[PDB]
Write a protein that binds this ligand. Structure first.
Ligand SMILES: *[C@@H]1O[C@H](CO)[C@@H](O[C@@H]2O[C@H](CO)[C@@H](O[C@@H]3O[C@H](CO)[C@@H](O)[C@H](O)[C@@H]3O)[C@H](O)[C@H]2NC(C)=O)[C@H](O)[C@H]1NC(C)=O
Ligand SMILES: *[C@@H]1O[C@H](CO)[C@@H](O[C@@H]2O[C@H](CO)[C@@H](O[C@@H]3O[C@H](CO)[C@@H](O)[C@H](O)[C@@H]3O)[C@H](O)[C@H]2NC(C)=O)[C@H](O)[C@H]1NC(C)=O
Ligand SMILES: *[C@@H]1O[C@H](CO)[C@@H](O)[C@H](O)[C@H]1NC(C)=O
Ligand SMILES: *[C@@H]1O[C@H](CO)[C@@H](O)[C@H](O)[C@H]1NC(C)=O
Ligand SMILES: *[C@@H]1O[C@H](CO)[C@@H](O)[C@H](O)[C@H]1NC(C)=O
Ligand SMILES: *[C@@H]1O[C@H](CO)[C@@H](O)[C@H](O)[C@H]1NC(C)=O
Lengths: 344, 271, 37, 98, 96, 43, 49, 49, 50
């Protein structure tokens, strides 16, 4: 097949490679955590405007996304750049739901990639925002002439992200500063927020909340729990230490980590050791064996007998009787009837 | 008091101000990292906390801008300095920090406080709760609290003739506050210059607060003249930080034993 | 080749040690300094 | 004086080292780790994200093969010269100058 | 990465020529040594008596007092070049 | 001048055009006044 | 700019490869010239042509 | 363009390898010249006659 | 762009505005205020060695 011919001459050829698949899945997560209320961050008789920016802190909690669907009025949980299916068990650190209420009539502007007048003056929305868009059916409760929800339409100039408008500084466009008069070319934020029912389909402020995201910069803080399983030794398994995917053989190690040090690396800028998340034990990560296969044949014009050479692997690791979990299914190579010879 | 000004001087920092940049443990490798570090052979100011005018309190708590980092150090014989109050303008309207060492707790108190003109403490506890908390009188609103063991594990109960070499780096970036520290013994009694020797600043604690800091202030502990409020001799160093490129040489143990920058001189760039 | 800073020119002719270029070489000799020739 | 033999080993080691180190390059992608880029992206763009890394790694391998062939040519020329020198100096007496 | 194996299949044959070139390079490397050294069809032996007209060849003739029949100068050269080599071991046993 | 710019330069040779001429003149003089004896030892 | 950088890098790599290829020819010519110098100028050669 | 350098920086080190490859040829040229021309130990001179 | 603006000897036609060279790069420009054109040459650059 690999020479694409029905006749093979005398020689040695390289055909494929062999490897060992993982046999077990091991997950090791910290056993300390707290309950995570997704929509209990706010608790008041009446909500406030964007200028509030005051909320309780949510952290070190089990962020089970099934709780989001458990609530009746929760609708939006999809991330624009990341599929929610993978997000169902993804772990993040220091994620909190911001408390700010906006009209919400610009759905495309909230998502990264677009900036507008509201982004120019009220609150900047940069084209590269790590936060996602989260929304739920709560317009009727928040919405109610009525200008209690003040918004800053005009400002000095464009503002950098996190430079929110807290202290009202009205625009100055003259020799004298605006002093107590809302004269020409001088505007005040005191105007109705369009609470009238003339646009009953939707114009009232809709609670759009963006949540800050961190990607494995620190050990996982907020995410749902998973079934912890005891670690195994001397077996090619799928290890899930600290929420990091991997596959290899776990064994005891003597890598003297510092009290704060967690990971380990070598000259090949790849992981080499890991510390147990539960007990104070140090283990070195190494993948299970692999190599190449060479076929020695005298030629199809003489005989169909062949000999198989395994490169760089001892005879004990890969005998001809192992068929439990490996590549090369039909590759039995018979048995020890023909003696195995160990070469360099 | 009606104290007078003092002229700040400078001294050579030699090879100082190296901390572990990353959590990953590596050994026998020569990794190069790009981060903020104290440049080799840079001017560092060395305020001398001595008995002012033989018993007159001095204003040795300057309102030094924080900029991007500090290399606060100490060659004190005993414990005289506690307090690293930060603030945008040091008033009741600005969120401020303070690292006190009351009893055996750091007491990380993140709130707004009204600060006196000359905040100071007492090293000896008052007789019969002490009245040491005179640095502030009112606290309005509070967000975060952190109580744990004191940052300072050094003890003077053994004997004298040996001083401390406390070193600290206060780095605040992107809503995080990291603290690094290390202590080593000193042989020579001369406080003019730091001994030439490599030291590693192992991290101690991380803070998730996102406060805006534009200034740095320090506090002193003066219990009593035993006129005014005074104690023994002390000295601390203040040094700023700017981004640089460094090369670190880990050992077999996994600890940084030497480092070479890449901007000091042509030989450094060649290396 | 260019502008060389940090070396002192000498009129003595020696065997080339470090080739600067265009027939000029530099070496460390005698108190002790780097010379170009 | 055995620098000629050491130069070949140094060149091969340096080429292998730079080939290994080239794996950490992002090639303009979001992340350099396959697991992270797979878990943190949707199928619509994960395909092109993986394709960029694939193209970069194929270019690196093609380059490495090219300089390997170039070095092999010079090694073969040196081997031919050495064989001629052996056959003409050891098995007989040579009248060729120098 | 099981998916990447399927994605790379869309790029045609970008692995056969690389393997063929590397195999050709290895074969040429073997052929070079065979051409340079294998020049005699007989293995001659020096006489037991080591007197050749007063010339002393003890520093280049092999000696049987070692497991490897290498001369003194050959041992010096091997020790000089052994700073870097292939590794002298390829059995994977010592690889952790 | 000579293209230049865009980071494309030319490095001067180590041996100038006069040393090569001196070498050739020395070789010619040796060949004329010695024959082939100057290539195996003293002239 | 990413695509522009990739194109310019490809052009630079091609130029470097061509220079490396030509260097081998120059090396062979220099070796032949040195051999001819040593065998014709410093002595008398019996090799035909 | 420093921003172009920033968007180039994530392509690893594709410049050091090219610099080394070109410096190899630059060094080899001088050796090529010296092997051919530097074949004598002394600078002989011809008699005035 | 950045370059050493200096006096120029090129004879632009009365309508001509821009200048070019063999490598297709900007070489001279028309003066807005006056009718005397100027040359553009990048200032010094090079590499170092230790
Ligand atoms: C890496 O760190 C260790 C300290 O943790 C450095 O010192 C080594 O410490 C170990 C532990 O005590 C020593 O082992 C001891 O050796 C004595 C014989 O000398 C033996 O009687 C004890 O029972 C114990 O096994 C070790 O000797 C000591 N030194 C070395 C070179 O390992 C170590 O030096 C650090 N590594 C380097 C490269 O400096
Ligand atoms: C041919 O050359 C070899 C190598 O030079 C000669 O062998 C050397 O002979 C000398 C003279 O005895 C040895 O020096 C001394 O040898 C004694 C032996 O016990 C030793 O104890 C002394 O410390 C001192 O080294 C020398 O070791 C020896 N070399 C070797 C490698 O054995 C040999 O004699 C020469 N043959 C003729 C016919 O000239
Ligand atoms: C849970 O984690 C803590 C981490 O400090 C550890 O001390 C404790 O033993 C763990 N629980 C169990 C049941 O092992
Ligand atoms: C640095 O310190 C030296 C020595 O004290 C002093 O002469 C110099 O003015 C200082 N430079 C600055 C910028 O402070
Ligand atoms: C060295 O040579 C220069 C001319 O190249 C000459 O001006 C100078 O005086 C000489 N110095 C001596 C001979 O010490
Ligand atoms: C194979 O056997 C063991 C390990 O299986 C070890 O001695 C070494 O790796 C190999 N030994 C021989 C004699 O091949």
């Amino acid at each position: 097949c690999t020479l694409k011919s029905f006749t093979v001459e005398k020689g040695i050829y390289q055909t494929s490679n062999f490897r060992v698949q993982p046999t077990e899945s091991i997950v090791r997560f910290p056993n300390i955590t707290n309950l995570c209320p997704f929509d209990e961050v706010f608790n008041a008789t009446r909500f406030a405007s964007v200028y509030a920016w005051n909320r309780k802190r949510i952290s070190n909690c089990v962020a089970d996304y099934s709780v989001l669907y458990n609530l009746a009025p929760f609708f939006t949980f999809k991330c624009y750049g990341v599929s929610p299916t993978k997000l169902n068990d993804l772990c993040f650190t220091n994620v909190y739901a911001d408390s700010f209420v906006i009209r919400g009539d610009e759905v495309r502007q909230i998502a990264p990639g677009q900036t507008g007048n509201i982004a120019d003056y009220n609150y900047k929305l940069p084209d590269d925002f790590t936060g996602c868009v989260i929304a739920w059916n709560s317009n009727k409760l928040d919405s109610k002439g009525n200008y209690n929800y003040l918004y800053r339409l005009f400002r000095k100039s464009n503002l950098k992200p996190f430079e929110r408008d807290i202290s009202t500084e009205i625009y100055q466009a003259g020799n004298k500063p605006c002093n107590g008069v809302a004269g020409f070319n001088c505007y005040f934020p005191l105007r109705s927020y369009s609470f009238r029912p003339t646009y009953g389909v939707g114009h009232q402020p809709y609670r759009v909340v963006v949540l800050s995201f961190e990607l494995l910069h620190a050990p996982a803080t907020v995410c749902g729990p998973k079934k912890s399983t005891n670690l195994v030794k001397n077996k090619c398994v799928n290890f899930n230490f600290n929420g990091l995917k991997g596959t290899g053989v776990l064994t005891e190690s003597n890598k003297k980590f510092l009290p704060f040090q967690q990971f380990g690396r070598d000259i090949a800028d790849t992981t080499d050791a890991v510390r147990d998340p539960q007990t104070l034990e140090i283990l070195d990560i190494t993948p299970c064996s692999f190599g190449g296969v060479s076929v020695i044949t005298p030629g199809t014009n003489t005989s169909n007998q062949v000999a198989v050479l395994y490169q760089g692997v001892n005879c004990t690791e890969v005998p001809v009787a192992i068929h439990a979990d490996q590549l090369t299914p039909t590759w039995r190579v018979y048995s020890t009837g023909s003696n195995v010879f160990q070469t360099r | 008091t009606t104290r007078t000004q003092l002229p700040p001087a400078y001294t050579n920092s030699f090879t100082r101000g190296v901390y572990y940049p990353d959590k990953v443990f590596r050994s026998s490798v020569l990794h190069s990292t790009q981060d903020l570090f104290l440049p080799f052979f840079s001017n560092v100011t060395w305020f001398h906390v001595i008995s002012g005018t033989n018993g007159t309190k001095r204003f040795d708590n300057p309102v030094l801008p924080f900029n991007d980092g500090v290399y606060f150090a100490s060659i004190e014989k005993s414990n005289i300095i506690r307090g690293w109050i930060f603030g945008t303008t040091l008033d009741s309207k600005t969120q401020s920090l303070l690292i006190v060492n009351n009893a055996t707790n750091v007491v990380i108190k993140v709130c707004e406080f009204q600060f006196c003109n000359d905040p100071f403490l007492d090293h000896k506890n008052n007789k019969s709760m002490e009245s040491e908390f005179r640095v502030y009188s009112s606290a309005n609103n509070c967000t975060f609290e952190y109580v744990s063991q004191p940052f300072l594990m050094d003890l003077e109960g053994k004997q004298g003739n040996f001083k401390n070499l406390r070193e600290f780096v206060f780095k605040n970036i992107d809503g995080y506050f990291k603290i690094y520290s290390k202590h080593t013994p000193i042989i020579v009694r001369e406080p003019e210059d730091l001994p030439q020797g490599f030291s590693a600043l192992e991290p101690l604690v991380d803070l998730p607060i996102g406060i805006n800091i534009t200034r740095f202030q320090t506090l002193l502990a003066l219990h009593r003249s035993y006129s005014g409020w005074t104690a023994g001799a002390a000295a601390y160093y203040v040094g700023y930080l700017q981004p640089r490129t460094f090369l670190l040489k880990y050992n077999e143990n996994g600890t940084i034993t030497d480092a070479v920058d890449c901007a000091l001189d042509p030989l450094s760039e060649t290396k | 080749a260019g502008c060389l800073i940090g070396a002192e020119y000498v009129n003595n002719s020696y065997e080339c040690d470090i080739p600067i270029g265009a027939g000029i070489c530099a070496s460390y000799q005698t108190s002790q300094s780097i010379i170009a020739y | 004086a055995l620098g000629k033999l050491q130069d070949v080993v140094n060149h091969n080691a340096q080429a292998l080292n730079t080939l290994v180190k080239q794996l950490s390059s992002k090639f303009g992608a979001i992340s350099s780790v396959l697991n992270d880029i797979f878990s943190r992206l949707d199928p619509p763009e994960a395909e092109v994200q993986i394709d960029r890394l694939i193209t970069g790694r194929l270019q690196s391998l093609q380059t490495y093969v090219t300089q390997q062939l170039i070095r092999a040519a010079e090694i073969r020329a040196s081997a031919n010269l050495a064989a001629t020198k052996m056959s003409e100096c050891v098995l007989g007496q040579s009248k060729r100058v120098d | 990465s099981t998916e990447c194996s399927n994605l790379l299949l869309q790029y045609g044959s970008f692995c056969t020529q690389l393997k063929r070139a590397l195999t050709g390079i290895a074969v040429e490397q073997d052929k070079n040594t065979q051409e340079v050294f294998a020049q005699v069809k007989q293995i001659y032996k020096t006489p037991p008596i080591k007197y050749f007209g007063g010339f002393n060849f003890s520093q280049i003739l092999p000696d049987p007092s070692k497991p490897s029949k290498r001369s003194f100068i050959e041992d010096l050269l091997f020790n000089k070049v052994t700073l870097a080599d292939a590794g002298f071991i390829k059995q994977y046993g010592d690889c952790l | 001048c000579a293209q230049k710019f865009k980071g494309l330069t030319v490095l001067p040779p180590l041996l100038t055009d006069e040393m090569i001429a001196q070498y050739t003149s020395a070789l010619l003089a040796g060949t004329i006044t010695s024959g082939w004896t100057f290539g195996a030892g003293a002239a």
